[PDB]
Write a protein that binds this ligand. Sequence first.
Ligand SMILES: COc1cc(/C=C/C(=O)OCCc2ccccc2)ccc1O
Ligand SMILES: COc1cc(/C=C/C(=O)OCCc2ccccc2)ccc1O
Lengths: 114, 115, 115, 114
Amino acid sequence: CPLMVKVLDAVRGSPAINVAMHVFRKAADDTWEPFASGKTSESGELHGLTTEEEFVEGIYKVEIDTKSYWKALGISPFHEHAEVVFTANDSGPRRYTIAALLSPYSYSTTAVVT
Amino acid sequence: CPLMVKVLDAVRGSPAINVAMHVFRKAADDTWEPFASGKTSESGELHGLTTEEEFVEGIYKVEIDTKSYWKALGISPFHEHAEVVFTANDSGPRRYTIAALLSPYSYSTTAVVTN
Amino acid sequence: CPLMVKVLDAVRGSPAINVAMHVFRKAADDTWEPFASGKTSESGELHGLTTEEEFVEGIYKVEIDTKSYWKALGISPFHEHAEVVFTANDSGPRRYTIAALLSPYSYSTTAVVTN
Amino acid sequence: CPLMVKVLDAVRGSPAINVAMHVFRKAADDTWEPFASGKTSESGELHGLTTEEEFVEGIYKVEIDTKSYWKALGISPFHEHAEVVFTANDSGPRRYTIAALLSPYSYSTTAVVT
Ligand SMILES: COc1cc(/C=C/C(=O)OCCc2ccccc2)ccc1O
Ligand SMILES: COc1cc(/C=C/C(=O)OCCc2ccccc2)ccc1O
């Protein structure tokens, strides 16, 4: 698992469950090509997005649908979504965990690269 | 200002000075159109991006060039930039302060919205 | 002010207003002595806690009563309070802005330190 | 494991390894009694701090020695330590994960209660 995402809910103190996200890879035409997607599990994690052979160097965008998450909970949110845009593997393949901590008017994102 | 951005550096405990950013507004054809741009001052703040008349309802994207900031300090950061996307003025004019706190492998963004 | 505190509410996207806090300074016998206290204004800021003369070198603790804040909004939060402990003025007088961002189960605190 | 701590380093994008912390329980005399301690593993986690029988309702303080962590890396930090003070189990025993994300002049802490 070269790429994993973990989402936490700072209002309820819980994993953020059933949060949809899409991963895009930057194309030579400067556009974002669909690459992977899924929704977080009961533990707030999304695994199996890609494989090491497929996960080559490049620029990736993870677009997390936070707005739908807050709407499902009946809470008015600020952001349309949370985006994490990064260059992968510029040192060669390692492992990437992207964590996002969500509040209605704030989010934090951190990468753990190991 | 109806729109102000403030950026802090969590490594040095200072305002993040001379950070470039670009604001876009989503057009009718779902394209991002350039709206405004600027750089943070010595206080880490960017004022005067827009006016109440020009800042109409819509979806806005603030793209903060955090990578160039970290690179100039000798640091290779994780993120290409920090992005903030939001619907503005949907229930009438508001004033928006977007705050960003920067670390090489992490950032947070908060909005303060006042009537 | 050599010491100012700013508190934001990440649930409502607003300054956190009327948040109480107490500042302590570590004494020679390693006890926390009361130093100053106050509440945030409508802008979420607390100014005038101390003066340059009184704010000597030492270890300081800012105890922000986040629990009473959340309770008054009908929310049962995780933390009893948010604490910030730091050595101040160790290399001469500085100005310290402590920023706190509050959610019911999370908080962050940053320091901006300027000469 | 009713109480677990996870620490991440936001400067290096890694688990914060060998971070010492002490857990205190509030005593009736208004003082903090030593309860548990340890240091984070290679994965930035500290497990086995307590057992469900021992982890009763009360006020707990986790004092994370962030200053020594930054000093070991040669980086000047702002905080003396990071403290997390909370009331446990006021709804009865659940599971507590305390996460802390560290920068030299900033820290964030979040609780995941499941
Ligand atoms: C630590 O909580 C945060 C607060 C904020 C908001 C910071 C702010 O509004 O500015 C306060 C610090 C400051 C520095 C220089 C001048 C004025 C205020 C942003 C991100 C955060 O994670
Ligand atoms: C508290 O500062 C943060 C930490 C993190 C990292 C959270 C994490 O790595 O997961 C902890 C949640 C968790 C861990 C193990 C078992 C259950 C829940 C993300 C954003 C933050 O602002």
